[PDB]
Amino acid sequence: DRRRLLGPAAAKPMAFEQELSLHTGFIENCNGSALVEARSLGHQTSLISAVYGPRSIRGSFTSQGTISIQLKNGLLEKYNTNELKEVSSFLMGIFNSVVNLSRYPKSGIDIFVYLTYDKDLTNNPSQISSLIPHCITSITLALADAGIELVDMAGAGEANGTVVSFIKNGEEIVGFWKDDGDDEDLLECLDRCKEQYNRYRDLMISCLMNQET
């Protein structure tokens, strides 16, 4: 590779109570940033969301804004690039309802979400589904911190691999992610994630009030 330093190509790689921590506006490189850390049981997730915009696009005739989201692997190389694109497409399907696009004509908002770490403990005699509500939490904070107009606070929850995002105080849905798990958990997951949403919502609102103060 003439672009980076990959080293020797003839070598081989190595072969072997909900708690939240919110911080926003710690990056001076962009318009809005957010830090989300969650620890449950033996599993914990820390990711960083960076927002750049809204910046004008030359020659653009779009009467509304344009959102672009990209997830990155900060440290541990676990999630496939194909899967990162899928979540990104899911995330954009959410905030296009959340973000007031009519406010930014001929403009574009780029959103970078760095998944620096996730720690997984598995006992021996999906996976990215659990990180999704934290990505939504981070972006919604980073957008609100940046000054981007949001119609409502976007939040979500993960129940047995079933992720569902809520706005307007859980009355409606802005996103739905179901993988594997079990059937007939429709009513249950909708109620369990709604509790996680309301919990994540109040902490998100309090976060802005704290830092803003």
Residues that bind other proteins (CB under 8 A): 2, 4-5, 10, 61, 63-64, 66-67, 80-83, 85-86, 88-90, 92-93, 96-97, 101, 152, 161, 166-168, 171-181, 183, 186, 190
Q: Which residue has the tokens 């972006």?
A: 139
Q: Which residue has the tokens 């995330």?
A: 91
Whole-Å CA distances, 203 to 164, 200, 208: 18, 5, 9
Q: Which residue, 19 or 180, has its beta carbon nearer to other proteins?
A: 180
Q: Which residue, 182 or 202, has its beta carbon nearer to other proteins?
A: 182
Smallest gap from residue 26 Cβ to other proteins (A): 29
Q: Which residues contact 38 (CB under 8 A, 6 or more apart)?
A: 18, 19, 20, 21, 44, 45, 46, 134
Smallest gap from residue 79 Cβ to other proteins (A): 10
CB atoms within 10 A of CB 135: 24
Q: Which residue, 117 or 176, has its beta carbon nearer to other proteins?
A: 176
Q: Which residue, 19 or 171, has its beta carbon nearer to other proteins?
A: 171
Smallest gap from residue 172 Cβ to other proteins (A): 4
Smallest gap from residue 31 Cβ to other proteins (A): 21
CA–CA separation, 98 vs 143, rounded Å? 10
Smallest gap from residue 92 Cβ to other proteins (A): 7
CB-based contact 87:132 (threshold 8 Å): yes
CA–CA separation, 14 vs 18, rounded Å? 33
Q: Which residue, 52 or 176, has its beta carbon nearer to other proteins?
A: 176
Q: Which residues contact 136 (CB under 8 A, 6 or more apart)?
A: 91, 94, 154, 155, 156, 165, 175
